[PDB]
Amino acid sequence: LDGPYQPTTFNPPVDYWMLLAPTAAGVVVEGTNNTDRWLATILVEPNVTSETRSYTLFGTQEQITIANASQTQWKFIDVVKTTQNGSYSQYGPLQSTPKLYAVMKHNGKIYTYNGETPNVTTKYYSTTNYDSVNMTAFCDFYIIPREEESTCTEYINNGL
Ligand SMILES: CO[C@]1(C(=O)O)C[C@H](O)[C@@H](NC(C)=O)[C@H]([C@H](O)[C@H](O)CO)O1
Numbered sequence: 087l088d089g090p091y092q093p094t095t096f097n098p099p100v101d102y103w104m105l106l107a108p109t110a111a112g113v114v115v116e117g118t119n120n121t122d123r124w125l126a127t128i129l130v131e132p133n134v135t136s137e138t139r140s141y142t143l144f145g146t147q148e149q150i151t152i153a154n155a156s157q158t159q160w161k162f163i164d165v166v167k168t169t170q171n172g173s174y175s176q177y178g179p180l181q182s183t184p185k186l187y188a189v190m191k192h193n194g195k196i197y198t199y200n201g202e203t204p205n206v207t208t209k210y211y212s213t214t215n216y217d218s219v220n221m222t223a224f225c226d227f228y229i230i231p232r233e234e235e236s237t238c239t240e241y242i243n244n245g246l
Pocket of ligand 1: 166167178209211212213
């Protein structure tokens with residue numbers, strides 16, 4: 087567990103999980119290869135009926151319709167597009183009590199956590215030039231090698 091690091095944009099090594107510890111609802115992390123993949127993770131508060139919100143994604147204001155069916159858990163949503171002018175689509179989510187998320191560049195993809203704490207799993211998004219994707223963290227974060235993924239999973243499920 088290397089960190090906490092303050093918000094910044096950098097090029098994380100492949101096969102490391104970037105464990106994010108946001109404190110507020112909103113954009114958590116975003117990264118793109120500038121060609122066929124844009125991913126931004128948004129943290130939505132517990133208990134939200136369908137509504138459109140404005141988020142700044144990659145420097146520009148975007149309207150996204152979100153919801154969170156859970157009465158008590160947070161919802162992390164990956165908002166992605168596959169071309170520069172394409173529409174954002176939602177995948178995931180991760181329903182969470184600890185408020186932690188993580189993202190990793192691995193084997194031609196970007197992986198993120200998914201499901202419902204305390205029994206999370208991971209999902210992925212194929213991404214060309216996956217190894218050079220820079221990630222912008224909007225909150226404090228830690229770095230954990232993939233070899234220690236069981237430790238990252240325990241933090242996502244139960245907190246630091
Ligand atoms: C093309 O197949 C895949 C991929 O990227 O390898 C399979 C992968 O399991 C799926 N992941 C999820 C969370 O649905 C992903 C997304 O649907 C797509 O990347 C969204 O842009 O599509």
